Amino acid sequence: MFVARSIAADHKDLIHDVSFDFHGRRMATCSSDQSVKVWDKSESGDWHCTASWKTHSGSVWRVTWAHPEFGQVLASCSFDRTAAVWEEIVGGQSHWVKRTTLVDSRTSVTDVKFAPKHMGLMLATCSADGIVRIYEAPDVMNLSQWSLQHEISCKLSCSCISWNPSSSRAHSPMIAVGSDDSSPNAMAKVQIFEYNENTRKYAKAETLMTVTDPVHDIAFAPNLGRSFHILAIATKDVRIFTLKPVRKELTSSGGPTKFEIHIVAQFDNHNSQVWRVSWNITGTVLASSGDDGCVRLWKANYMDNWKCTGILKGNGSPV
């Protein structure tokens, strides 16, 4: 029940990543020539570029937005071992200005993500050496200053990370890390770290044993007040997992919360290496893209079972 259209946007080079703002009125796209462009939607519904500049010495992988409450902030990770933070200042032509650069990585910075709003202005970066670094800006009015708050070693090449968007008062912060190592040995590829208030340190909580193939993308789904967490894993086949916390005994509060892991959907319609996965706002529709040049939309049904609902092709031609 999904139809496609082509947006009249002109690009000269190959597009690596596209990202939306919170309200869905601003777009950020990174191209193959170390260039970043920002697009705005008019009241009529048309898109117009508003800024463009070159950022790093190496290739640019990912660019993401921050929450509007902190202003207009973009974060970009690059192959040249850097992660840059940009803020828009207008005096009206937009004039984006770099405010800070994080260079603590010893390998290529593979991915960068923003923390959920209710935890302040935090940022996370996973590198190729197996290191996840979490920074925080103590003052929201001075973005030029950042401090390295936490550092975690994964012993495997990190490839993607995702925060837990839950904002309940009973869920500790959670971050999940994937890997794309293709070692012949059968080793786990997805680990989850849960913050501990009693120690103020992140510790490993659960590791997905059933996942052994290289992983390219991992995505939590929006909580929306449910009683459990939904995770999506992109591999040779799209997989969906549900994690339910167990009732913590009041006798003693100890380490990480124990979880029950159940798989609820495993699709192999791409017949290739699935590359990207994403959720809608309500966490009820899953979008997946793989090497077959097709985009597939999955949704639940009356019987609470997962089945495909849409198939499209990269050219925009419907199937």
| Residue ranges binding another protein (CB under 8 A) | 22-23, 68-69, 140-141, 167-170, 223-228, 281-284, 304
The size of the chain, in residues, is 319
CB of 100 to another protein, least distance (A): 19
CB of 144 to another protein, least distance (A): 15
- The two structure tokens encoding residue 92: 């009206």
| C-alpha span between 187 and 193 (Å, rounded) | 18
As beta bridge partners, residue 310 has: 297
Q: What is the DSSP string of 141-171?
A: T-TT--EEEEEEE-SS-EEEEEE-----TT-
When the beta carbons of 42 and 182 are compared against another protein, the nearer one is 42
CB of 36 to another protein, least distance (A): 25
| C-alpha span between 136 and 150 (Å, rounded) | 9
* CB atoms near residue 19 (< 10 Å): 15
CB of 244 to another protein, least distance (A): 10
When the beta carbons of 173 and 178 are compared against another protein, the nearer one is 173
Strands 238-245 and 294-299, bridge-based pairing = unpaired
When the beta carbons of 166 and 235 are compared against another protein, the nearer one is 166
When the beta carbons of 169 and 247 are compared against another protein, the nearer one is 169
Contacts of 266 (CB under 8 A, 6+ apart): 237, 238, 239, 240
* CB atoms near residue 67 (< 10 Å): 15
CB of 282 to another protein, least distance (A): 6
When the beta carbons of 20 and 275 are compared against another protein, the nearer one is 20
